[PDB]
Amino acid sequence: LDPFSLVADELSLLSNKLREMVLAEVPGVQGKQFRSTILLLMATALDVTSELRVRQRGIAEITEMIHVASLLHDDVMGNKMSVLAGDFLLSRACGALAALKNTEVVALLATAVEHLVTGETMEITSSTEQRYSMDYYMQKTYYKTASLISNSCKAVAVLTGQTAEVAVLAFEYGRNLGLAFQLIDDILDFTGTSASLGKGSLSDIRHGVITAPILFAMEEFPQLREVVDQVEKDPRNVDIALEYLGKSKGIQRARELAMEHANLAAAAIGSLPETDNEDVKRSRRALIDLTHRVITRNK
Amino acid sequence: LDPFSLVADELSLLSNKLREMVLAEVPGVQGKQFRSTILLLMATALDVTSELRVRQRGIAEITEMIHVASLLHDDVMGNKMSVLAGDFLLSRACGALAALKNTEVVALLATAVEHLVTGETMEITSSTEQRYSMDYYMQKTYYKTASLISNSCKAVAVLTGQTAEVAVLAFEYGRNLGLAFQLIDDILDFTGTSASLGKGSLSDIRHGVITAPILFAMEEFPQLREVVDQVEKDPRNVDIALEYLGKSKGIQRARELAMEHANLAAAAIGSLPETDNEDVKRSRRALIDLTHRVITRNK
């Protein structure tokens, strides 16, 4: 029915198991939902038992641990204790991972963490010319936002003993849905729920974070580049930038790019081995509908 | 002959393999020595092949990666890029670890990284009463300095398919030699190579880092505690503190504690299964002599 309500039970379990948080001290859930939901649906969308359901859920918890650990480090509660918390988290994720008794999966999330660093480094170590390139943008975007979801999707495949070919398909779904999700985010930051340019929260542009819509606008307005570079010397530069954006096809181009990607995801699901399991079919349908929802969301 | 020169070849290999550092950019070795040497000697001190020598060397490289990653995070090149480098390193260590095809070993270094965080947290989150306790001190000291070497030593055992009992012995050697090494460091920071109180570099006390010698001195001079708390308001408090230290048996007590520990290490080597391999014997002898050297070093 609804991609989420289809796996709402397996999600409740993870909300509960998050009660590991019961250590005495003497003296926004949409994010978690999206990633775990993908991983759970993906799990029931490959034909292979409650002992696997648990291993497969584990990947979901590991993914959220690695993720949170990513947020903390990004901040740098006080810098050093942010760093600690994050490392604590990474350690446990590495523990839980060894607990799944699979070396290939361990290798996959290791690589996920590596890409995440690579992407953060590209954000931090880019030349202006890199900062204004769509190619570099999409690359960094892959590493920073999509690698975690893709590699996780592969790990749910590998841990279910799927073909090496079906495994690149899980990956593909995750990579493309991931990119699409990020491109739609970039858009909503400008348009908000209101679907109106300017009524968005505008936190990216306000902080010198150049994204897809502006990058495409730069293609048709070379004047934009210098304006955006002073987007912190005077708020009015943000105003000016938005006017150029509104005269361009940037929001539009970014949305058509997101759609192309959500399609490649849907396509990957459509390339999966045929199956007669009415429950596998239903999962697969949920994965496809998810691609449509990433595109139409206003939040 | 000399614990080091006995494994100088296997060390050269690791110095070479550190040439992985050959990525084009278009446009103090005593530490490494001690840890790797222990891990290498330990490897040839358990009766079990060049395919193992390599796996066992891997643990040595992983240990140094995790370590360096520890130094970087401790600093928090610029905070965030310190954090990145460190995470990069952790990722690779987790990669190389999965490459060894052993889940138990993965679990061990995960726990090592966890203790390391725990120790850093104890340094950062201690109540004054904790800061002046020898018990808390030794605990934190274990986590922060010894857990990495012990867990690594266990991993060299586990990866050589030794008994679960011989494995706690490798661990024991590493834990105790580790603690002893740290206690001797604390001492040398006050006495320097000169073996004279005051001629040391004094960086711990100069920066409000209270260590074993001062902790034991506090036992016999309750006046010391407030003096040490103002060791940064006026340099002369460091002077004053050292006079109390010099009237106490603190340096002495810390050294007798280091010796007790280096002994428990030697003891663990002496508890290993008998063997007729003249090369295993020789390794074991090297591990024992190492315990004596940690105690007599002036650098």
mmCIF file of all heavy atoms in Angstrom, chain A residues 214-235:
data_model
loop_
_atom_site.group_PDB
_atom_site.id
_atom_site.type_symbol
_atom_site.label_atom_id
_atom_site.label_comp_id
_atom_site.label_asym_id
_atom_site.label_seq_id
_atom_site.Cartn_x
_atom_site.Cartn_y
_atom_site.Cartn_z
ATOM 1 N N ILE A 214 21.737 26.450 -8.508
ATOM 2 C CA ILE A 214 22.605 27.574 -8.799
ATOM 3 C C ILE A 214 23.635 27.198 -9.851
ATOM 4 O O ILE A 214 23.967 28.004 -10.718
ATOM 5 C CB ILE A 214 23.340 28.026 -7.578
ATOM 6 C CG1 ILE A 214 22.340 28.521 -6.552
ATOM 7 C CG2 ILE A 214 24.328 29.150 -7.958
ATOM 8 C CD1 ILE A 214 21.744 29.886 -6.908
ATOM 9 N N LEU A 215 24.161 25.981 -9.766
ATOM 10 C CA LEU A 215 25.144 25.515 -10.727
ATOM 11 C C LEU A 215 24.579 25.524 -12.125
ATOM 12 O O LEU A 215 25.279 25.897 -13.069
ATOM 13 C CB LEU A 215 25.638 24.114 -10.392
ATOM 14 C CG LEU A 215 26.569 24.045 -9.177
ATOM 15 C CD1 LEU A 215 27.007 22.607 -8.915
ATOM 16 C CD2 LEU A 215 27.774 24.925 -9.431
ATOM 17 N N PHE A 216 23.333 25.103 -12.295
ATOM 18 C CA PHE A 216 22.748 25.140 -13.644
ATOM 19 C C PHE A 216 22.485 26.603 -14.066
ATOM 20 O O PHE A 216 22.595 26.961 -15.239
ATOM 21 C CB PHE A 216 21.424 24.384 -13.691
ATOM 22 C CG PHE A 216 21.555 22.893 -13.710
ATOM 23 C CD1 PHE A 216 21.003 22.127 -12.699
ATOM 24 C CD2 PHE A 216 22.185 22.245 -14.768
ATOM 25 C CE1 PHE A 216 21.068 20.742 -12.738
ATOM 26 C CE2 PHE A 216 22.253 20.847 -14.812
ATOM 27 C CZ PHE A 216 21.692 20.098 -13.794
ATOM 28 N N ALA A 217 22.103 27.441 -13.105
ATOM 29 C CA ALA A 217 21.836 28.844 -13.390
ATOM 30 C C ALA A 217 23.134 29.504 -13.822
ATOM 31 O O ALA A 217 23.135 30.374 -14.687
ATOM 32 C CB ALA A 217 21.265 29.560 -12.168
ATOM 33 N N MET A 218 24.238 29.101 -13.220
ATOM 34 C CA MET A 218 25.483 29.682 -13.627
ATOM 35 C C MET A 218 25.748 29.400 -15.098
ATOM 36 O O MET A 218 26.370 30.189 -15.784
ATOM 37 C CB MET A 218 26.608 29.144 -12.784
ATOM 38 C CG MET A 218 26.749 29.855 -11.496
ATOM 39 S SD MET A 218 28.091 29.131 -10.591
ATOM 40 C CE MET A 218 27.848 29.860 -8.955
ATOM 41 N N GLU A 219 25.270 28.277 -15.609
ATOM 42 C CA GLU A 219 25.509 27.994 -17.012
ATOM 43 C C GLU A 219 24.951 29.116 -17.887
ATOM 44 O O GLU A 219 25.592 29.541 -18.847
ATOM 45 C CB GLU A 219 24.894 26.661 -17.413
ATOM 46 C CG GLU A 219 25.650 25.452 -16.907
ATOM 47 C CD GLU A 219 25.094 24.160 -17.500
ATOM 48 O OE1 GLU A 219 24.248 24.255 -18.442
ATOM 49 O OE2 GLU A 219 25.502 23.060 -17.031
ATOM 50 N N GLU A 220 23.775 29.617 -17.549
ATOM 51 C CA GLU A 220 23.206 30.667 -18.358
ATOM 52 C C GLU A 220 23.323 32.109 -17.828
ATOM 53 O O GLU A 220 22.734 33.022 -18.379
ATOM 54 C CB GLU A 220 21.754 30.280 -18.748
ATOM 55 C CG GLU A 220 20.599 30.649 -17.859
ATOM 56 C CD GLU A 220 19.289 29.907 -18.266
ATOM 57 O OE1 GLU A 220 19.187 28.670 -18.047
ATOM 58 O OE2 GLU A 220 18.352 30.555 -18.801
ATOM 59 N N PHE A 221 24.123 32.329 -16.793
ATOM 60 C CA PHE A 221 24.319 33.673 -16.245
ATOM 61 C C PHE A 221 25.684 33.752 -15.610
ATOM 62 O O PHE A 221 25.804 33.627 -14.408
ATOM 63 C CB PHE A 221 23.282 34.007 -15.171
ATOM 64 C CG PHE A 221 21.919 34.343 -15.705
ATOM 65 C CD1 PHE A 221 20.807 33.614 -15.311
ATOM 66 C CD2 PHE A 221 21.742 35.396 -16.589
ATOM 67 C CE1 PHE A 221 19.538 33.927 -15.789
ATOM 68 C CE2 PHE A 221 20.463 35.731 -17.089
ATOM 69 C CZ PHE A 221 19.364 35.002 -16.693
ATOM 70 N N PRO A 222 26.737 33.994 -16.404
ATOM 71 C CA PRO A 222 28.102 34.070 -15.853
ATOM 72 C C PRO A 222 28.342 35.150 -14.808
ATOM 73 O O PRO A 222 29.361 35.216 -14.159
ATOM 74 C CB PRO A 222 28.978 34.230 -17.104
ATOM 75 C CG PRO A 222 28.085 34.905 -18.086
ATOM 76 C CD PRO A 222 26.746 34.211 -17.864
ATOM 77 N N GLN A 223 27.356 35.975 -14.626
ATOM 78 C CA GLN A 223 27.405 37.071 -13.682
ATOM 79 C C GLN A 223 27.116 36.559 -12.276
ATOM 80 O O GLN A 223 27.534 37.135 -11.270
ATOM 81 C CB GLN A 223 26.338 37.998 -14.164
ATOM 82 C CG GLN A 223 25.876 37.398 -15.493
ATOM 83 C CD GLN A 223 24.725 38.078 -16.006
ATOM 84 O OE1 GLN A 223 24.087 38.835 -15.282
ATOM 85 N NE2 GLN A 223 24.408 37.843 -17.261
ATOM 86 N N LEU A 224 26.423 35.433 -12.226
ATOM 87 C CA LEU A 224 26.015 34.819 -10.976
ATOM 88 C C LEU A 224 27.169 34.431 -10.078
ATOM 89 O O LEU A 224 27.127 34.640 -8.862
ATOM 90 C CB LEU A 224 25.173 33.597 -11.302
ATOM 91 C CG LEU A 224 24.372 32.874 -10.247
ATOM 92 C CD1 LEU A 224 23.770 33.892 -9.298
ATOM 93 C CD2 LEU A 224 23.270 32.071 -10.920
ATOM 94 N N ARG A 225 28.196 33.855 -10.687
ATOM 95 C CA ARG A 225 29.364 33.383 -9.964
ATOM 96 C C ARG A 225 29.963 34.391 -8.977
ATOM 97 O O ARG A 225 30.192 34.049 -7.830
ATOM 98 C CB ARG A 225 30.424 32.900 -10.961
ATOM 99 C CG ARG A 225 31.664 32.289 -10.334
ATOM 100 C CD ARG A 225 32.806 31.991 -11.352
ATOM 101 N NE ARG A 225 32.639 30.810 -12.234
ATOM 102 C CZ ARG A 225 31.995 30.787 -13.413
ATOM 103 N NH1 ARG A 225 31.417 31.884 -13.911
ATOM 104 N NH2 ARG A 225 31.947 29.651 -14.115
ATOM 105 N N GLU A 226 30.199 35.635 -9.388
ATOM 106 C CA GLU A 226 30.793 36.582 -8.446
ATOM 107 C C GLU A 226 29.828 37.025 -7.369
ATOM 108 O O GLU A 226 30.247 37.340 -6.261
ATOM 109 C CB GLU A 226 31.340 37.808 -9.146
ATOM 110 C CG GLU A 226 32.546 38.371 -8.428
ATOM 111 C CD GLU A 226 33.794 37.568 -8.705
ATOM 112 O OE1 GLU A 226 33.676 36.501 -9.335
ATOM 113 O OE2 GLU A 226 34.891 37.994 -8.306
ATOM 114 N N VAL A 227 28.542 37.057 -7.710
ATOM 115 C CA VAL A 227 27.479 37.424 -6.786
ATOM 116 C C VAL A 227 27.421 36.409 -5.649
ATOM 117 O O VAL A 227 27.332 36.739 -4.484
ATOM 118 C CB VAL A 227 26.116 37.400 -7.479
ATOM 119 C CG1 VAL A 227 24.982 37.659 -6.450
ATOM 120 C CG2 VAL A 227 26.088 38.417 -8.552
ATOM 121 N N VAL A 228 27.461 35.152 -6.024
ATOM 122 C CA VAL A 228 27.390 34.077 -5.069
ATOM 123 C C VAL A 228 28.620 34.032 -4.165
ATOM 124 O O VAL A 228 28.547 33.584 -3.039
ATOM 125 C CB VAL A 228 27.178 32.739 -5.841
ATOM 126 C CG1 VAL A 228 27.345 31.557 -4.917
ATOM 127 C CG2 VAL A 228 25.793 32.750 -6.475
ATOM 128 N N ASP A 229 29.747 34.513 -4.645
ATOM 129 C CA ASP A 229 30.962 34.479 -3.849
ATOM 130 C C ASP A 229 30.881 35.528 -2.735
ATOM 131 O O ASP A 229 31.573 35.432 -1.729
ATOM 132 C CB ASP A 229 32.196 34.629 -4.796
ATOM 133 C CG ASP A 229 33.285 35.639 -4.295
ATOM 134 O OD1 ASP A 229 33.974 35.367 -3.265
ATOM 135 O OD2 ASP A 229 33.471 36.706 -4.967
ATOM 136 N N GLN A 230 30.000 36.503 -2.882
ATOM 137 C CA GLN A 230 29.878 37.512 -1.853
ATOM 138 C C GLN A 230 28.564 37.359 -1.105
ATOM 139 O O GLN A 230 28.065 38.292 -0.457
ATOM 140 C CB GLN A 230 29.988 38.891 -2.475
ATOM 141 C CG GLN A 230 31.399 39.423 -2.409
ATOM 142 C CD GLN A 230 31.715 40.386 -3.535
ATOM 143 O OE1 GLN A 230 32.052 39.969 -4.654
ATOM 144 N NE2 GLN A 230 31.606 41.679 -3.255
ATOM 145 N N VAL A 231 28.029 36.149 -1.158
ATOM 146 C CA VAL A 231 26.762 35.872 -0.542
ATOM 147 C C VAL A 231 26.815 35.920 0.962
ATOM 148 O O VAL A 231 25.844 35.575 1.613
ATOM 149 C CB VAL A 231 26.228 34.499 -0.991
ATOM 150 C CG1 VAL A 231 26.838 33.407 -0.160
ATOM 151 C CG2 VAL A 231 24.724 34.470 -0.891
ATOM 152 N N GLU A 232 27.944 36.331 1.523
ATOM 153 C CA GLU A 232 28.069 36.421 2.982
ATOM 154 C C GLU A 232 28.577 37.810 3.435
ATOM 155 O O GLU A 232 28.603 38.115 4.617
ATOM 156 C CB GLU A 232 28.944 35.264 3.509
ATOM 157 C CG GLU A 232 28.219 33.868 3.412
ATOM 158 C CD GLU A 232 29.120 32.609 3.636
ATOM 159 O OE1 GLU A 232 29.971 32.273 2.770
ATOM 160 O OE2 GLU A 232 28.960 31.938 4.684
ATOM 161 N N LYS A 233 28.944 38.651 2.472
ATOM 162 C CA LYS A 233 29.395 40.020 2.740
ATOM 163 C C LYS A 233 28.142 40.910 2.886
ATOM 164 O O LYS A 233 28.169 41.948 3.560
ATOM 165 C CB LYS A 233 30.214 40.592 1.552
ATOM 166 C CG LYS A 233 31.691 40.198 1.429
ATOM 167 C CD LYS A 233 32.617 41.116 2.271
ATOM 168 C CE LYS A 233 34.135 40.816 2.066
ATOM 169 N NZ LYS A 233 35.059 41.715 2.857
ATOM 170 N N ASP A 234 27.056 40.509 2.224
ATOM 171 C CA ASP A 234 25.830 41.295 2.232
ATOM 172 C C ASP A 234 24.685 40.395 1.824
ATOM 173 O O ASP A 234 24.650 39.883 0.709
ATOM 174 C CB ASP A 234 25.952 42.446 1.228
ATOM 175 C CG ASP A 234 24.926 43.548 1.447
ATOM 176 O OD1 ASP A 234 23.693 43.315 1.399
ATOM 177 O OD2 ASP A 234 25.377 44.678 1.669
ATOM 178 N N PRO A 235 23.709 40.229 2.713
ATOM 179 C CA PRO A 235 22.531 39.390 2.496
ATOM 180 C C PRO A 235 21.894 39.667 1.154
ATOM 181 O O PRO A 235 21.354 38.761 0.517
ATOM 182 C CB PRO A 235 21.590 39.793 3.631
ATOM 183 C CG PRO A 235 22.466 40.480 4.629
ATOM 184 C CD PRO A 235 23.459 41.203 3.787
#
